[PDB]
Amino acid sequence: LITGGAGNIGEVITRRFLAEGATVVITGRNAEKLAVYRRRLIDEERVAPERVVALRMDGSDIAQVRAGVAQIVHGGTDVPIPLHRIDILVNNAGSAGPRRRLVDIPLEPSEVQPPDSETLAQAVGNLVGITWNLTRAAAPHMPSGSSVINISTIFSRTDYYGRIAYVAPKAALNALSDGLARELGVRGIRVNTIYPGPIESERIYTMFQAMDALKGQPEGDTASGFLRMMRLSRIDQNGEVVKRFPSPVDVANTAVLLASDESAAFTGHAFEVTHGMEVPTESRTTFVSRPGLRSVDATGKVILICAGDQVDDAVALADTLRSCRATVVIGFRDPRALEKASVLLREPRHALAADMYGRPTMTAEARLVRLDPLDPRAAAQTLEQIHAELGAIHHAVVLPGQSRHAPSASLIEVDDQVVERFLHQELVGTIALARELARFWEEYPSGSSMHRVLFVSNPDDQQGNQYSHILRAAVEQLVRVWRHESEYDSVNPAHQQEGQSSAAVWANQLIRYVNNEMANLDFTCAWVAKLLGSDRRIAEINLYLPEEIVGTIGVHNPGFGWAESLFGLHMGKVALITGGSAGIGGQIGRLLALSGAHVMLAA
Amino acid sequence: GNIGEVITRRFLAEGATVVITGRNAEKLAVYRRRLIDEERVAPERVVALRMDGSDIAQVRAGVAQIVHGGTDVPIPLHRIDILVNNAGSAGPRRRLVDIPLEPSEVQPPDSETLAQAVGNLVGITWNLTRAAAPHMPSGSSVINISTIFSRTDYYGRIAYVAPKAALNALSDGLARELGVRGIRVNTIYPGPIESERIYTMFQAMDALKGQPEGDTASGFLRMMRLSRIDQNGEVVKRFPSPVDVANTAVLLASDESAAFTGHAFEVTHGMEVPTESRTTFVSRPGLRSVDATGKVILICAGDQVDDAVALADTLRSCRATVVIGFRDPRALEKASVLLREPRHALAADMYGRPTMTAEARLVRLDPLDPRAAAQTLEQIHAELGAIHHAVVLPGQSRHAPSASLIEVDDQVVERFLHQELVGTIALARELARFWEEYPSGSSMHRVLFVSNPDDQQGNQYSHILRAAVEQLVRVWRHESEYDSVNPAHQQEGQSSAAVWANQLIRYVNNEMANLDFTCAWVAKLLGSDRRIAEINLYLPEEIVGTIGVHNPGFGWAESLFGLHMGKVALITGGSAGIGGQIGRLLALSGAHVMLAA
């Protein structure tokens, strides 16, 4: 019925489902010691024992009980009800996690504080891993026309200061439901993705007072910002333009219908119970044009290309960045990839020169360092060592760790090894790398220009690109929060850099798993170079690229700044060329035709 | 139809009241009643009224008052009522070039003229919305059923998509406005019935398209999920069901789901389709590759003298002749006086060099009035030849003096819905016929649909026109491309060409360069070979904010970009004269300069 049956919204919903049935399988807490007597007396009120199953099932984060049914398929606590199939299942997590900035998130258990609950890996698990493993558990079971219900925060699209550990895994259940609807609907199972809104009470009020005290703004700033966002006015206790926040009664009212037969039509339905809100649920901008790269001037800057295992595109991306006449430091996650990349880069065509326009440049040779977000202290020491070697680090392209995740696209019948590799190494790994970058930005001296961190995604796998999909969707909210919450910190008296001056961060994420051409690699790197080396600020988080090689506009840019400078010079002027079939004449005719004139080649 | 029957059947009980209203042909209640009362329940709750077909504001208000007062039996008291907007007609099934503008063109399939087709279930819905302004009890609800094809490319039903669209924009504006009182409008998408009529209709469409049988239905059976239980396993794509969507919609209308306001009711069983095909301008286009030497651009202008003349200047800067047609009278002479001045009477290209391009002609066009616009189209044909580039601007600058939608009582919105939506549809066919009646082998046909600018209080009407345009462009582009290969229509004269249209929304940017950015985007999608795969285009909320570029015809400085990059230069006496200009162009090139004087 409801995963969060222990002191959770679902534990409250247990008061329902009894008028037309009975509330059963109320999952208990992890401790399971005081949970046996917890809410047992409350549940016994106005409800006979009957077959109501209030067993304190262990909501384990890891899959040690995944094979175990515990009222799923067979066995059970005391009755054979696991043999029966329950028509509903809820993927609620109910773990807020730590509430801190991007400099001091508790990555390891030694870094935890009493205000903190769990660690970074635990925090990511408590919101993604339980969802995924409970989805896999008892997959062939449940009725042929059952229902699957999710619950996520409505802040998964709105900015949320100091809650990256909350939203970064909370921006992943929606993506996973999106990717799983297509591959699950076959058997005839729907995924009702319903988001109950914040409940109006004194707790959220005090939360917001603490919130705007932390950000450093006058009282009621966040309250005004989230009240003006409201477009509808409630009719509770009549009145006019009350504009009260959403109530849990409406949450129960919109949740109970999933058990009824009327829900059979819905599938993949965004069902945000927040009433009358306008947010751009998805932020994107398909590239209409092809960027001009001969106005970047990235010289005098260091670009740490944090590549995990996909160094194949990295070496080329590093060379393209070198073409901007910029020094680069290529960082590697896997150990053996370092040797292969060194061998590949030693050969010319990768370490040749900083070839830009129609001319070369020495610039600096591409360095080679080993990094790993799994170990915090080693990665921080390596970053400090790079600081001592060169100085500050501002431009940092961030690529995922492993290339082409998993051998198969299926996400139902899979062993947990690859899935647990995807978590704790791509989500947690990238969050850890962002943590180290933010530590370097804050606790170490930097400049005044804004800080750029691109988040290029995995390429096309000729299949369902869900493994790049989760990466993109979990990166979107992360970069959005990192962008918005790092502006108040640059002016507040709390964080004045110990009297020094610093800058905020602006971070997009390119998406290239939608094109399937051969020039898409040059296209993405071009966009990467333009977003790093130039001055520009796009207000959209995610950036999408066209569905064709050239897409809307047909341009190829093989270092042809001259042909770009010669555009439209002699427009609409017929030209006659004698002997223009070999030598200087052919070249003059070709450059004139590229200019725009009309040419008549005679030989 | 069937969904209305099921809704009325569910009304028979559960503490509900049934009202079979909205009679057709001004008298249909007698033809459609007394069958709901045939059930044991509701001995008197069954109510039928012979309301006017057009349902103007005053007659709608009278009908509402007589319903509140009942059939003289109950005390007069306004209360809740049925506000579902399911009442409507399909309209003509005419093809992409032929259209019933005048009533004389009535056909057995086309029982309604263009204006009547537009008002079938759009104008009447808006008028009923206005007539339900004064007294709607708190906690009520109202929906506007739209078709699921309001985003999917269609064929032969431009009159069932262009007016069937913009209901979303009207609902958006009404949700923003009327939400203060505590009322809601949510778009609802009941799917096609799994009946034999819809099955044979698909077969007819396949035959009409000139394609092998089954591919049109394959487009629905391929990119649509199943996620159903019917027939136990192996539930093949059978399209959504009407009874389920009707029952769920009326359950939303009842309690247990109050104040949802998070429902689009897009019941297509998956069917991944964007809610709006659009992109953002994160870069400024480079107008250097634009070429229109041998091309004629006719600007379908209106009373907007300033904007149309600016567009004419920015297109004539691409060495092209123009024909500026103005919709309303008494504006031709002002345009002539303004254009007489040398500011707009001289054409200079993007480098700042004057060009001896043909001057700006001036004609008079009357979209809403057929047989005269076509005559003028043929006249300008005889004058110049075929015309392919048609920038279509709206009728009036500000569609209403007050930025509101429900306070009015059908006085100016009639002019809007009759001369700026229908007007556009009439002009679109006027142009389509010129292109198809006279086939011309060339590139695809380009029809931009620039929207009006923003001054204050946003642009609710612009939103409406945008929603109607996106679909008109989408459905058209599809039909055109499909009909470019059919030998049936190919034999008419010579070989023709397809059409590719777009939109260039501007009502979101409020700056000083939004009337120059718009000129750049109109001149880039016409004078170049760039096929946007997305329908609606949108300006950035901040021009200098995302990409600040200033282009007063300065293509030289654009050509001199990144030449001497990362070099330090020392200049002597570089404060005024030749050396100052060398320093200026070198700094624009990318080098580092050190001015000393």
PDB file of N, CA and C in Angstrom, chain A residues 298-371:
ATOM      1  N   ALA A 298      39.766  32.303 -24.760  1.00  0.00           N
ATOM      2  CA  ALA A 298      39.880  31.620 -23.479  1.00  0.00           C
ATOM      3  C   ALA A 298      41.319  31.547 -22.975  1.00  0.00           C
ATOM      4  N   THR A 299      42.199  32.418 -23.462  1.00  0.00           N
ATOM      5  CA  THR A 299      43.605  32.358 -23.088  1.00  0.00           C
ATOM      6  C   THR A 299      43.813  32.795 -21.642  1.00  0.00           C
ATOM      7  N   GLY A 300      44.890  32.292 -21.044  1.00  0.00           N
ATOM      8  CA  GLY A 300      45.226  32.643 -19.679  1.00  0.00           C
ATOM      9  C   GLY A 300      44.349  32.010 -18.626  1.00  0.00           C
ATOM     10  N   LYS A 301      43.640  30.936 -18.965  1.00  0.00           N
ATOM     11  CA  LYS A 301      42.733  30.274 -18.041  1.00  0.00           C
ATOM     12  C   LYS A 301      42.958  28.770 -18.091  1.00  0.00           C
ATOM     13  N   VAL A 302      42.714  28.111 -16.962  1.00  0.00           N
ATOM     14  CA  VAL A 302      42.912  26.673 -16.819  1.00  0.00           C
ATOM     15  C   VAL A 302      41.549  25.996 -16.817  1.00  0.00           C
ATOM     16  N   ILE A 303      41.433  24.934 -17.626  1.00  0.00           N
ATOM     17  CA  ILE A 303      40.139  24.199 -17.752  1.00  0.00           C
ATOM     18  C   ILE A 303      40.355  22.745 -17.329  1.00  0.00           C
ATOM     19  N   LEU A 304      39.898  22.385 -16.130  1.00  0.00           N
ATOM     20  CA  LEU A 304      40.025  21.028 -15.608  1.00  0.00           C
ATOM     21  C   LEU A 304      38.894  20.181 -16.179  1.00  0.00           C
ATOM     22  N   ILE A 305      39.222  19.331 -17.150  1.00  0.00           N
ATOM     23  CA  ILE A 305      38.227  18.502 -17.833  1.00  0.00           C
ATOM     24  C   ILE A 305      38.098  17.217 -17.021  1.00  0.00           C
ATOM     25  N   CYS A 306      37.155  17.217 -16.080  1.00  0.00           N
ATOM     26  CA  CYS A 306      36.954  16.077 -15.194  1.00  0.00           C
ATOM     27  C   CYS A 306      36.220  14.947 -15.906  1.00  0.00           C
ATOM     28  N   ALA A 307      36.952  14.125 -16.651  1.00  0.00           N
ATOM     29  CA  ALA A 307      36.385  12.999 -17.379  1.00  0.00           C
ATOM     30  C   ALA A 307      36.562  11.718 -16.576  1.00  0.00           C
ATOM     31  N   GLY A 308      35.489  10.936 -16.467  1.00  0.00           N
ATOM     32  CA  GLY A 308      35.558   9.701 -15.712  1.00  0.00           C
ATOM     33  C   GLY A 308      36.208   8.550 -16.454  1.00  0.00           C
ATOM     34  N   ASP A 309      35.529   8.047 -17.489  1.00  0.00           N
ATOM     35  CA  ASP A 309      36.059   6.884 -18.252  1.00  0.00           C
ATOM     36  C   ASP A 309      35.972   7.193 -19.748  1.00  0.00           C
ATOM     37  N   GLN A 310      34.978   7.988 -20.152  1.00  0.00           N
ATOM     38  CA  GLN A 310      34.836   8.373 -21.581  1.00  0.00           C
ATOM     39  C   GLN A 310      35.893   9.432 -21.914  1.00  0.00           C
ATOM     40  N   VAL A 311      37.143   9.004 -22.109  1.00  0.00           N
ATOM     41  CA  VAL A 311      38.242   9.952 -22.464  1.00  0.00           C
ATOM     42  C   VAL A 311      38.342  10.029 -23.989  1.00  0.00           C
ATOM     43  N   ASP A 312      37.639   9.139 -24.695  1.00  0.00           N
ATOM     44  CA  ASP A 312      37.700   9.114 -26.180  1.00  0.00           C
ATOM     45  C   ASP A 312      37.267  10.484 -26.709  1.00  0.00           C
ATOM     46  N   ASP A 313      36.092  10.958 -26.288  1.00  0.00           N
ATOM     47  CA  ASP A 313      35.627  12.311 -26.695  1.00  0.00           C
ATOM     48  C   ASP A 313      36.426  13.356 -25.912  1.00  0.00           C
ATOM     49  N   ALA A 314      36.835  13.020 -24.685  1.00  0.00           N
ATOM     50  CA  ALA A 314      37.580  13.977 -23.833  1.00  0.00           C
ATOM     51  C   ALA A 314      38.828  14.471 -24.572  1.00  0.00           C
ATOM     52  N   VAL A 315      39.703  13.552 -24.992  1.00  0.00           N
ATOM     53  CA  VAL A 315      40.973  13.958 -25.665  1.00  0.00           C
ATOM     54  C   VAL A 315      40.635  14.976 -26.761  1.00  0.00           C
ATOM     55  N   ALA A 316      39.633  14.675 -27.593  1.00  0.00           N
ATOM     56  CA  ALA A 316      39.220  15.604 -28.670  1.00  0.00           C
ATOM     57  C   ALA A 316      38.684  16.897 -28.047  1.00  0.00           C
ATOM     58  N   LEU A 317      37.858  16.778 -27.004  1.00  0.00           N
ATOM     59  CA  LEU A 317      37.296  17.974 -26.322  1.00  0.00           C
ATOM     60  C   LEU A 317      38.453  18.796 -25.745  1.00  0.00           C
ATOM     61  N   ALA A 318      39.435  18.126 -25.139  1.00  0.00           N
ATOM     62  CA  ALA A 318      40.611  18.838 -24.590  1.00  0.00           C
ATOM     63  C   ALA A 318      41.320  19.575 -25.729  1.00  0.00           C
ATOM     64  N   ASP A 319      41.517  18.900 -26.864  1.00  0.00           N
ATOM     65  CA  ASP A 319      42.225  19.515 -28.018  1.00  0.00           C
ATOM     66  C   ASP A 319      41.428  20.731 -28.510  1.00  0.00           C
ATOM     67  N   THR A 320      40.109  20.572 -28.648  1.00  0.00           N
ATOM     68  CA  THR A 320      39.241  21.701 -29.069  1.00  0.00           C
ATOM     69  C   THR A 320      39.443  22.855 -28.086  1.00  0.00           C
ATOM     70  N   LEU A 321      39.424  22.550 -26.787  1.00  0.00           N
ATOM     71  CA  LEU A 321      39.628  23.600 -25.753  1.00  0.00           C
ATOM     72  C   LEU A 321      41.022  24.199 -25.956  1.00  0.00           C
ATOM     73  N   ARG A 322      42.016  23.348 -26.250  1.00  0.00           N
ATOM     74  CA  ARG A 322      43.392  23.838 -26.538  1.00  0.00           C
ATOM     75  C   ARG A 322      43.316  24.815 -27.713  1.00  0.00           C
ATOM     76  N   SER A 323      42.494  24.498 -28.720  1.00  0.00           N
ATOM     77  CA  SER A 323      42.369  25.362 -29.922  1.00  0.00           C
ATOM     78  C   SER A 323      41.968  26.777 -29.491  1.00  0.00           C
ATOM     79  N   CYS A 324      41.276  26.899 -28.355  1.00  0.00           N
ATOM     80  CA  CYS A 324      40.882  28.233 -27.828  1.00  0.00           C
ATOM     81  C   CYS A 324      42.117  28.915 -27.230  1.00  0.00           C
ATOM     82  N   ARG A 325      43.295  28.305 -27.398  1.00  0.00           N
ATOM     83  CA  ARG A 325      44.558  28.880 -26.859  1.00  0.00           C
ATOM     84  C   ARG A 325      44.468  28.902 -25.331  1.00  0.00           C
ATOM     85  N   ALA A 326      43.980  27.809 -24.736  1.00  0.00           N
ATOM     86  CA  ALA A 326      43.864  27.710 -23.289  1.00  0.00           C
ATOM     87  C   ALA A 326      44.594  26.476 -22.780  1.00  0.00           C
ATOM     88  N   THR A 327      45.238  26.617 -21.625  1.00  0.00           N
ATOM     89  CA  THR A 327      45.873  25.480 -20.974  1.00  0.00           C
ATOM     90  C   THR A 327      44.817  24.599 -20.318  1.00  0.00           C
ATOM     91  N   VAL A 328      45.014  23.284 -20.399  1.00  0.00           N
ATOM     92  CA  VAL A 328      44.044  22.325 -19.887  1.00  0.00           C
ATOM     93  C   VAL A 328      44.734  21.332 -18.966  1.00  0.00           C
ATOM     94  N   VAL A 329      43.941  20.737 -18.076  1.00  0.00           N
ATOM     95  CA  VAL A 329      44.392  19.704 -17.148  1.00  0.00           C
ATOM     96  C   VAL A 329      43.332  18.610 -17.179  1.00  0.00           C
ATOM     97  N   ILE A 330      43.618  17.518 -17.875  1.00  0.00           N
ATOM     98  CA  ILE A 330      42.659  16.434 -18.050  1.00  0.00           C
ATOM     99  C   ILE A 330      42.736  15.512 -16.841  1.00  0.00           C
ATOM    100  N   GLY A 331      41.615  15.356 -16.146  1.00  0.00           N
ATOM    101  CA  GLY A 331      41.532  14.522 -14.953  1.00  0.00           C
ATOM    102  C   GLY A 331      40.775  13.242 -15.256  1.00  0.00           C
ATOM    103  N   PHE A 332      41.190  12.153 -14.613  1.00  0.00           N
ATOM    104  CA  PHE A 332      40.695  10.820 -14.925  1.00  0.00           C
ATOM    105  C   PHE A 332      40.175  10.147 -13.667  1.00  0.00           C
ATOM    106  N   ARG A 333      39.105   9.356 -13.818  1.00  0.00           N
ATOM    107  CA  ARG A 333      38.527   8.624 -12.658  1.00  0.00           C
ATOM    108  C   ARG A 333      39.114   7.207 -12.590  1.00  0.00           C
ATOM    109  N   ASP A 334      39.114   6.471 -13.708  1.00  0.00           N
ATOM    110  CA  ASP A 334      39.658   5.125 -13.723  1.00  0.00           C
ATOM    111  C   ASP A 334      41.184   5.161 -13.810  1.00  0.00           C
ATOM    112  N   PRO A 335      41.866   4.196 -13.182  1.00  0.00           N
ATOM    113  CA  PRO A 335      43.335   4.218 -13.174  1.00  0.00           C
ATOM    114  C   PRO A 335      43.967   3.815 -14.498  1.00  0.00           C
ATOM    115  N   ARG A 336      43.454   2.761 -15.139  1.00  0.00           N
ATOM    116  CA  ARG A 336      44.090   2.272 -16.358  1.00  0.00           C
ATOM    117  C   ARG A 336      43.808   3.165 -17.560  1.00  0.00           C
ATOM    118  N   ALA A 337      42.767   3.998 -17.497  1.00  0.00           N
ATOM    119  CA  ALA A 337      42.503   4.927 -18.590  1.00  0.00           C
ATOM    120  C   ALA A 337      43.617   5.957 -18.730  1.00  0.00           C
ATOM    121  N   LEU A 338      44.332   6.239 -17.637  1.00  0.00           N
ATOM    122  CA  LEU A 338      45.411   7.220 -17.678  1.00  0.00           C
ATOM    123  C   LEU A 338      46.503   6.800 -18.655  1.00  0.00           C
ATOM    124  N   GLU A 339      46.916   5.531 -18.603  1.00  0.00           N
ATOM    125  CA  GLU A 339      47.970   5.053 -19.493  1.00  0.00           C
ATOM    126  C   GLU A 339      47.530   5.089 -20.953  1.00  0.00           C
ATOM    127  N   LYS A 340      46.308   4.632 -21.236  1.00  0.00           N
ATOM    128  CA  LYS A 340      45.817   4.637 -22.610  1.00  0.00           C
ATOM    129  C   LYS A 340      45.715   6.057 -23.151  1.00  0.00           C
ATOM    130  N   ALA A 341      45.225   6.989 -22.332  1.00  0.00           N
ATOM    131  CA  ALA A 341      45.119   8.371 -22.783  1.00  0.00           C
ATOM    132  C   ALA A 341      46.491   9.001 -22.974  1.00  0.00           C
ATOM    133  N   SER A 342      47.457   8.662 -22.116  1.00  0.00           N
ATOM    134  CA  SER A 342      48.813   9.165 -22.310  1.00  0.00           C
ATOM    135  C   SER A 342      49.399   8.660 -23.622  1.00  0.00           C
ATOM    136  N   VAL A 343      49.192   7.376 -23.925  1.00  0.00           N
ATOM    137  CA  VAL A 343      49.683   6.819 -25.183  1.00  0.00           C
ATOM    138  C   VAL A 343      49.014   7.504 -26.369  1.00  0.00           C
ATOM    139  N   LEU A 344      47.695   7.700 -26.293  1.00  0.00           N
ATOM    140  CA  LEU A 344      46.970   8.318 -27.401  1.00  0.00           C
ATOM    141  C   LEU A 344      47.385   9.775 -27.594  1.00  0.00           C
ATOM    142  N   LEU A 345      47.571  10.511 -26.496  1.00  0.00           N
ATOM    143  CA  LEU A 345      47.884  11.932 -26.574  1.00  0.00           C
ATOM    144  C   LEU A 345      49.337  12.176 -26.960  1.00  0.00           C
ATOM    145  N   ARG A 346      50.235  11.234 -26.653  1.00  0.00           N
ATOM    146  CA  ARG A 346      51.627  11.383 -27.067  1.00  0.00           C
ATOM    147  C   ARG A 346      51.739  11.491 -28.583  1.00  0.00           C
ATOM    148  N   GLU A 347      50.980  10.675 -29.305  1.00  0.00           N
ATOM    149  CA  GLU A 347      50.955  10.765 -30.756  1.00  0.00           C
ATOM    150  C   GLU A 347      50.417  12.131 -31.180  1.00  0.00           C
ATOM    151  N   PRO A 348      50.865  12.710 -32.319  1.00  0.00           N
ATOM    152  CA  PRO A 348      50.306  13.982 -32.801  1.00  0.00           C
ATOM    153  C   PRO A 348      48.800  13.868 -33.085  1.00  0.00           C
ATOM    154  N   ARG A 349      48.174  14.953 -33.559  1.00  0.00           N
ATOM    155  CA  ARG A 349      46.712  14.964 -33.855  1.00  0.00           C
ATOM    156  C   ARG A 349      45.941  15.187 -32.547  1.00  0.00           C
ATOM    157  N   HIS A 350      46.645  15.187 -31.412  1.00  0.00           N
ATOM    158  CA  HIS A 350      45.997  15.415 -30.093  1.00  0.00           C
ATOM    159  C   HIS A 350      46.854  16.403 -29.303  1.00  0.00           C
ATOM    160  N   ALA A 351      48.179  16.302 -29.437  1.00  0.00           N
ATOM    161  CA  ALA A 351      49.086  17.226 -28.769  1.00  0.00           C
ATOM    162  C   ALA A 351      49.806  18.127 -29.764  1.00  0.00           C
ATOM    163  N   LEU A 352      49.262  18.267 -30.974  1.00  0.00           N
ATOM    164  CA  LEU A 352      49.932  18.980 -32.054  1.00  0.00           C
ATOM    165  C   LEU A 352      50.172  20.445 -31.713  1.00  0.00           C
ATOM    166  N   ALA A 353      49.096  21.216 -31.562  1.00  0.00           N
ATOM    167  CA  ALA A 353      49.193  22.650 -31.315  1.00  0.00           C
ATOM    168  C   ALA A 353      47.795  23.184 -31.034  1.00  0.00           C
ATOM    169  N   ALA A 354      47.739  24.464 -30.665  1.00  0.00           N
ATOM    170  CA  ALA A 354      46.473  25.161 -30.444  1.00  0.00           C
ATOM    171  C   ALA A 354      46.001  25.779 -31.760  1.00  0.00           C
ATOM    172  N   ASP A 355      45.634  24.898 -32.687  1.00  0.00           N
ATOM    173  CA  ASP A 355      45.245  25.317 -34.029  1.00  0.00           C
ATOM    174  C   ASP A 355      43.895  26.023 -33.982  1.00  0.00           C
ATOM    175  N   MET A 356      43.895  27.320 -34.282  1.00  0.00           N
ATOM    176  CA  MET A 356      42.684  28.121 -34.362  1.00  0.00           C
ATOM    177  C   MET A 356      42.724  28.973 -35.621  1.00  0.00           C
ATOM    178  N   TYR A 357      41.541  29.299 -36.149  1.00  0.00           N
ATOM    179  CA  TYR A 357      41.419  30.032 -37.405  1.00  0.00           C
ATOM    180  C   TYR A 357      42.121  29.257 -38.514  1.00  0.00           C
ATOM    181  N   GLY A 358      43.160  29.850 -39.094  1.00  0.00           N
ATOM    182  CA  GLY A 358      43.995  29.151 -40.046  1.00  0.00           C
ATOM    183  C   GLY A 358      45.456  29.152 -39.632  1.00  0.00           C
ATOM    184  N   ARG A 359      45.722  29.001 -38.337  1.00  0.00           N
ATOM    185  CA  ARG A 359      47.072  29.160 -37.819  1.00  0.00           C
ATOM    186  C   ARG A 359      47.264  28.377 -36.525  1.00  0.00           C
ATOM    187  N   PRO A 360      48.505  27.941 -36.209  1.00  0.00           N
ATOM    188  CA  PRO A 360      48.750  27.187 -34.997  1.00  0.00           C
ATOM    189  C   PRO A 360      49.218  28.063 -33.834  1.00  0.00           C
ATOM    190  N   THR A 361      49.304  27.474 -32.649  1.00  0.00           N
ATOM    191  CA  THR A 361      49.758  28.151 -31.445  1.00  0.00           C
ATOM    192  C   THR A 361      50.283  27.102 -30.477  1.00  0.00           C
ATOM    193  N   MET A 362      51.412  27.402 -29.831  1.00  0.00           N
ATOM    194  CA  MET A 362      52.003  26.447 -28.899  1.00  0.00           C
ATOM    195  C   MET A 362      51.110  26.241 -27.681  1.00  0.00           C
ATOM    196  N   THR A 363      50.685  27.336 -27.050  1.00  0.00           N
ATOM    197  CA  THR A 363      49.843  27.320 -25.843  1.00  0.00           C
ATOM    198  C   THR A 363      50.532  26.440 -24.799  1.00  0.00           C
ATOM    199  N   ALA A 364      49.844  25.470 -24.203  1.00  0.00           N
ATOM    200  CA  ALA A 364      50.439  24.579 -23.221  1.00  0.00           C
ATOM    201  C   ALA A 364      50.018  23.146 -23.508  1.00  0.00           C
ATOM    202  N   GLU A 365      50.906  22.213 -23.183  1.00  0.00           N
ATOM    203  CA  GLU A 365      50.626  20.801 -23.390  1.00  0.00           C
ATOM    204  C   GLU A 365      49.578  20.313 -22.394  1.00  0.00           C
ATOM    205  N   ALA A 366      48.771  19.349 -22.831  1.00  0.00           N
ATOM    206  CA  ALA A 366      47.716  18.802 -21.987  1.00  0.00           C
ATOM    207  C   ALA A 366      48.320  17.935 -20.889  1.00  0.00           C
ATOM    208  N   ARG A 367      48.052  18.296 -19.636  1.00  0.00           N
ATOM    209  CA  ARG A 367      48.541  17.537 -18.496  1.00  0.00           C
ATOM    210  C   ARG A 367      47.671  16.302 -18.272  1.00  0.00           C
ATOM    211  N   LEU A 368      48.060  15.480 -17.299  1.00  0.00           N
ATOM    212  CA  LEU A 368      47.350  14.238 -17.010  1.00  0.00           C
ATOM    213  C   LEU A 368      47.426  13.970 -15.516  1.00  0.00           C
ATOM    214  N   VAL A 369      46.272  13.989 -14.845  1.00  0.00           N
ATOM    215  CA  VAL A 369      46.184  13.752 -13.411  1.00  0.00           C
ATOM    216  C   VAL A 369      45.097  12.713 -13.158  1.00  0.00           C
ATOM    217  N   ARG A 370      45.170  12.082 -11.988  1.00  0.00           N
ATOM    218  CA  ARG A 370      44.225  11.052 -11.574  1.00  0.00           C
ATOM    219  C   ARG A 370      43.365  11.596 -10.439  1.00  0.00           C
ATOM    220  N   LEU A 371      42.045  11.522 -10.608  1.00  0.00           N
ATOM    221  CA  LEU A 371      41.095  12.008  -9.619  1.00  0.00           C
ATOM    222  C   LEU A 371      40.051  10.935  -9.343  1.00  0.00           C
TER     223      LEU A 371
END
